[PDB]
Amino acid sequence: HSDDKKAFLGALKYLPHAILKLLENMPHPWEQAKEVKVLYH
Amino acid sequence: AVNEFQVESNISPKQLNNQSVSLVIPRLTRDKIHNSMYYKVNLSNESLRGNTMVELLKVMIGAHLHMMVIEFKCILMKLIEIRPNFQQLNFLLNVKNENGFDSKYIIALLLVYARLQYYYENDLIKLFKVQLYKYSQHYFKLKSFPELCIIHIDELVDWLATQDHIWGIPLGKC
Amino acid sequence: REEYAEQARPIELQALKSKYTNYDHLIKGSLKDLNKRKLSFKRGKKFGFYCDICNLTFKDTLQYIDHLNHKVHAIKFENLFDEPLIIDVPQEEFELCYHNLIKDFVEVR
Amino acid sequence: AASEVATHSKLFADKKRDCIDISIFSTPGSVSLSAYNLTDEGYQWGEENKDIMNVLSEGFEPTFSTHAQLLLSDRITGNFIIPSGNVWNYTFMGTAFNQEGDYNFKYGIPLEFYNEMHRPVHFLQFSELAGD
Amino acid sequence: LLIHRKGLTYLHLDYNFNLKPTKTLTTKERKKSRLGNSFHLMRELLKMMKLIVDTHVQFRLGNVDAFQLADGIHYILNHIGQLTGIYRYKYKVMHQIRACKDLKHIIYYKFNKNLGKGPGCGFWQPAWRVWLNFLRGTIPLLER
Amino acid sequence: TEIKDIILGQNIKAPSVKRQKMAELEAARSEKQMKTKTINAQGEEIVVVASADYESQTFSSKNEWRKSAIANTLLYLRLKNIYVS
Ligand SMILES: [Zn+2]
């Protein structure tokens, strides 16, 4: 999908709730890499 | 532009790292080229009879020498947008040893081209790079303009692969 | 009068083709550079930039070339004769064509 | 002056030492005939100093132009020789003039400095003004 | 997508989300190119995303040691004011930023008391909690 | 004009040469309804542009062919008086 609007209605509708969760889950400096659950469109 | 429900920036077609071909070059410089005279005259569909790599080479080969390494930015950009075959890159690189005026300014053109293409067919690309290293050892001299600076192929190839930005276009690390 | 009411209700062309195809010669209509010339775009203004395909003349360069890059001018250019503008690479393209680029390049040089 | 002496020297360097010059001063209402000679030092100066050389002209100084003896008479008359092309003034023909080059010559009547034969470029520019 | 949907293609978004036009704008163009503070704000938050995720990328990438990573995040979250323009599009963020600087100073003291002064102060926790407590408030605003 | 001639003429009011040329510059081109080829620079661009109105002011006074060539006719007058020191 790198290179339909009706399907992007809700996806574009809530961007920032994803910014919240992601910025909330930041790997802490004592943790190399963090596996995380993801709900994607 | 396109009328309905979307506006497509430039052509932005095809392939080359899963997103788009024209994304390799910034919007500002890309629109400087697409708004430049040379691009609208000697290139694209009406000049090249649609996308044609060999006639695209007819333009650059057709161009003391007047062409200095604007025109280079443009011809490189159309090389990008057309995106010919890596095999054709191999031939165009290694053929025609019976004439010395053929690859003159084509060297750094086919070079910066593959420099923009991909970062790691893979082994063939690596052979292309090490061959470009051999030509960096070939001790060649050329002139370049934006000011005026003459630079040696050994300095521009090594300084280019080691350097982030080249003549305004950024590069990634292979 | 009746005819009026009804209306209300070669090789040189190939040379013209050879002109409007190669731009390097077409690029320059500016040979006058800075010069004073004494005398709805249709059938030419007797000045400006000449497009014979659609019979329009354009006072500026970006309009003359931009119109040429436009589809309609290409559609008319094709409807004149053929469709080369729309016209793979099975290696014979760069082998034979590229070899013709070296050969013709040496011929010109 | 320098532009004159250098030219004199270039013409007559090894050819004739005692040849003279007629410098005609011209202004509206009257003209004046100022004749001059040249010594052997001026030829050397012209040989060395051709292009520019304003300071060495200053040092050159009034010397050496010795005032030659010239007379003006109605008791004799004379004639002109002109080049075969009959264009002596190459002002606007810049490519055709050659400072050392051979030309055929003939007797005839010379033309005006600005005359139709000497100004051909103007006609192509004149008709080119309207164009076509 | 939203910019092209707006019908203007000449506003360029950097991959860092910095918005700059392609060419100079006429009086008519500027008015049409003006977008609400909502959009600019969302862009700024996506620039937070881009900055911190860039830092962690260059950590996973072999560029930088972990110390300069934690100093990286720290520098971001405290330096938001100079390094990002959220305060312009919503000024109530200054309460956050002013609070971020405050905790900032505190940490530096407790961190820099014996050792000295300079870069390398870690412990980005409190300013980061401040920012999460900013998002939880400003999310319904931008979603709406 | 007969009255103003017998008595005043408004102190014989004549707009001077200045006021004439400036009255020309002020006046609009009476009837609003040549072409010159020029090279012009758009934003970050160079474009050949056809121009209009008046660029046509030209000086070329004492120089080139015209003034000296016209001045050449008077040269027979320079030999009426001829003298040398
Ligand atoms: Zn046309």
Q: What long-range pairs does B110-117 form, CB within 8 A, spacing at least 24?
A: B111/B157, B111/B160, B112/B76, B112/B160, B112/B166, B113/B76, B113/B79, B113/B80, B113/B89, B114/B86, B114/B89, B115/B160, B115/B161, B115/B166, B115/B171, B116/B24, B116/B25, B116/B76, B116/B80, B116/B169, B116/B171, B117/B16, B117/B83
Residue E107 is encoded by which pair of tokens?
A: 């940490």
Cβ C38 vs Cβ D130: under 8 Å: yes
- Distance CA(A29)–CA(E66), nearest Å, equals 7
Chain centroid offset of residue F26 CA: 16
Closest listed residue to residue D67, CA positions, set B2, E17, F84, F28: F84
Cβ contact (<8 Å) for B20 and A5? no
Cβ contact (<8 Å) for F34 and C38? yes
Technique that determined the structure: cryo-EM
Chain C contact partners (≥3 CB pairs within 8 A): B, D, F
In DSSP notation, C4-58 reads HHHHH--HHHHHHHHHHH-HHHHS---TT-SEEE-----S--SSSEEETTTTEEE
Q: Which residues of E touch B1 (CB under 8 A)?
A: 9
Lookup result for tokens 């293409």: B117
For chain F, positions 29-48, list CB contacts with chain C under 8 A: 34-39, 42, 45, 47-48
Residue E35 is encoded by which pair of tokens?
A: 């977008």
Chain centroid offset of residue B42 CA: 16
Distance spanning both ends of chain B, measured CA to CA: 36
Handedness of CA B57, B63, B64, B66 (dihedral sign): negative
Using the mean position of ligand 1's atoms as its centre, give its distance from the Cα of residue F37 in Å: 20
Chain centroid offset of residue C72 CA: 12
Find the closest chain F residue to D120 by CA distance.
F65
Amino acid at D132: D
How many CB atoms sit inside 10 A of residue E96's CB? 22
How many CB atoms sit inside 10 A of residue E48's CB? 20
- Distance CA(E70)–CA(C63), nearest Å, equals 56
Length of chain A: 41
Check if D109 contacts C (Cβ < 8 Å). no
Query: Resolution in angstroms, to 1 decimal, for this deposition?
Result: 7.2
**Residue C47 Cα, gap to closest chain B Cα (Å):** 21
Helices (H), ranges, B51-85? 53-62, 71-82
Phi/psi for C60 (5° steps) reads -125, 160
Report the SS3 class of residue B147. coil
Residue B86 is encoded by which pair of tokens?
A: 């890596």
Residue E85 is encoded by which pair of tokens?
A: 């323009």
Find the closest chain E residue to F45 by CA distance.
E23
Residue E103 is encoded by which pair of tokens?
A: 């905790």
Closest listed residue to residue B9, CA positions, set E36, E3, C72: E3
Chain centroid offset of residue B50 CA: 18
Q: Which residues of D touch C36 (CB under 8 A)?
A: 129
Cβ E81 vs Cβ E48: under 8 Å: no
- Cβ contacts below 8 Å, chain B against chain F, sum to 7
* Bridge partners for B166 per DSSP: B169
Phi-psi bin for F25: left (phi > 0), alpha (psi -120 to 50), beta? alpha
Check if B7 contacts E (Cβ < 8 Å). yes
Phi/psi for D44 (5° steps) reads -60, -45
* Cβ neighbourhood burial of E6 (10 Å; 0-12, 13-18, 19+): middle
**Which helix (DSSP H) or strand (DSSP E) does residue E96 occupy?**
helix E93-112
For residue C108, tell me if it sits in a domain.
yes
Residues having C-beta closer than 5 Å to ion ligand 1: C 51, 53-54, 73
DSSP strand pairing (D30-36 vs B165-166): unpaired
- Distance CA(E108)–CA(E99), nearest Å, equals 14
- Distance CA(C85)–CA(C72), nearest Å, equals 12
CA atoms within 13 A on the CB side of E10: 13
Report the SS3 class of residue E79. helix
Per-position b or e across D3-28, b if 16+ CB within 10 A of its CB: eebbebbeebeeeeeeeebeeeeeee
Cβ D30 vs Cβ F82: under 8 Å: yes
Q: Which domain holds residue C14?
A: 10-109
Select from C32, C48, C61 the Cβ nearest to the Cβ of F47: C61
Using the mean position of ligand 1's atoms as its centre, give its distance from the Cα of residue D78 in Å: 68
For residue C2, tell me if it sits in a domain.
no
Chain F contact partners (≥3 CB pairs within 8 A): B, C, D, E
Closest listed residue to residue F52, CA positions, set F72, F70, F32, F69: F32
Check if D131 contacts C (Cβ < 8 Å). yes
Amino acid at B155: E
In DSSP notation, chain A reads ----HHHHHHHHH-SHHHHHHHHHSPPPTT-S---------
For chain F, positions 10-29, list CB contacts with chain C under 8 A: none
For residue C14, tell me if it sits in a domain.
yes
Cβ E142 vs Cβ E38: under 8 Å: yes
Distance spanning both ends of chain A, measured CA to CA: 12
- Distance CA(D37)–CA(D16), nearest Å, equals 12
Q: Which residues of C touch B61 (CB under 8 A)?
A: 101, 105
- Distance CA(C16)–CA(C53), nearest Å, equals 10
* Bridge partners for F38 per DSSP: F49
Number of domains in chain C: 1
Check if E24 contacts F (Cβ < 8 Å). yes
Find the closest chain B residue to C63 by CA distance.
B40
Closest listed residue to residue D58, CA positions, set D12, D9, D110, D1: D1
For chain E, positions 87-116, list CB contacts with chain A under 8 A: none
- Distance CA(B54)–CA(C101), nearest Å, equals 8
For residue C25, tell me if it sits in a domain.
yes
The answer to whether the peptide bond before residue D64 is cis (omega within 30 degrees of 0) is: yes
Select from D28, D32, D34 the Cβ nearest to the Cβ of F74: D28
What residues have CB less than 8 Å from B171, skipping those under 6 apart?
A: B115, B116, B160, B163, B164, B165
